[PDB]
Design a protein around this ligand. Structure first.
Ligand SMILES: Nc1nc2c(ncn2[C@@H]2O[C@H](COP(=O)(O)OP(=O)(O)O)[C@@H](O)[C@H]2O)c(=O)[nH]1
Ligand SMILES: [Mg+2]
Length: 166
């Protein structure tokens, strides 16, 4: 048996979802998915990353839901609750407050940020401690770090599903 982890990325148009996926998988910057084999501690896993109705089953199979906003656009941060709630509604996870979400505040390379780090960290903390990363898909800042945690938390979820045949 091999270990396949499904990860989906949500967030407003233009925040950097496609760029983050490409930077992570291909280290290049410029309904579908890319795949990458990653080691989690000493366990090899294949992450299948899906870029964004798509239908309920699309969401139901996910092991981690990544939420992305643009630190220079307060409106994309404001929609995070809607993206989180919509994923919950579509995926119907059995332990909503523990399902793995990872939030990425992207484009930190643009010095005139409009959303404060503390504000975004507080939002994440208040949803049962969702992990938070500030990234730059353009300059490859914290992208490997963010996705390593996405991989580890998706593995935890996938393990839970497999061990209790959920
Ligand atoms: N400065 C900067 N621009 C970025 C970054 N990530 C993406 N972009 C740019 O912002 C636009 C939208 O990015 P795109 O990846 O297509 O995001 P999507 O619509 O969420 O999938 C494009 O012009 C990208 O080149 C980043 O980290 N920094
Ligand atoms: Mg896109």
């Amino acid at each position: 048996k091999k270990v396949l982890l499904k990860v989906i990325i949500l967030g407003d148009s233009g925040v950097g979802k496609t760029s983050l996926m490409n930077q992570y998988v291909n280290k290049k910057f410029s309904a579908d998915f890319l795949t990458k084999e990653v080691m989690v501690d000493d366990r090899l896993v294949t992450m299948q990353i899906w870029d964004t109705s798509l239908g309920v089953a699309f969401y139901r199979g996910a092991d981690c839901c990544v939420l992305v906003f643009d630190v220079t656009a307060p409106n994309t941060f404001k929609t995070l609750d809607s993206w989180r709630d919509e994923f919950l509604i579509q995926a119907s996870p059995r332990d909503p407050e523990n399902f793995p979400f990872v939030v990425l505040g992207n484009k930190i390379d643009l010095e005139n940020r409009q959303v404060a780090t503390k504000r975004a960290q507080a939002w994440c903390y208040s949803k049962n401690n969702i992990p938070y990363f500030e990234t730059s898909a353009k300059e490859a800042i914290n992208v490997e770090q963010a996705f390593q945690t996405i991989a580890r938390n998706a593995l935890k979820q996938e393990t839970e599903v497999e061990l209790y045949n959920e």
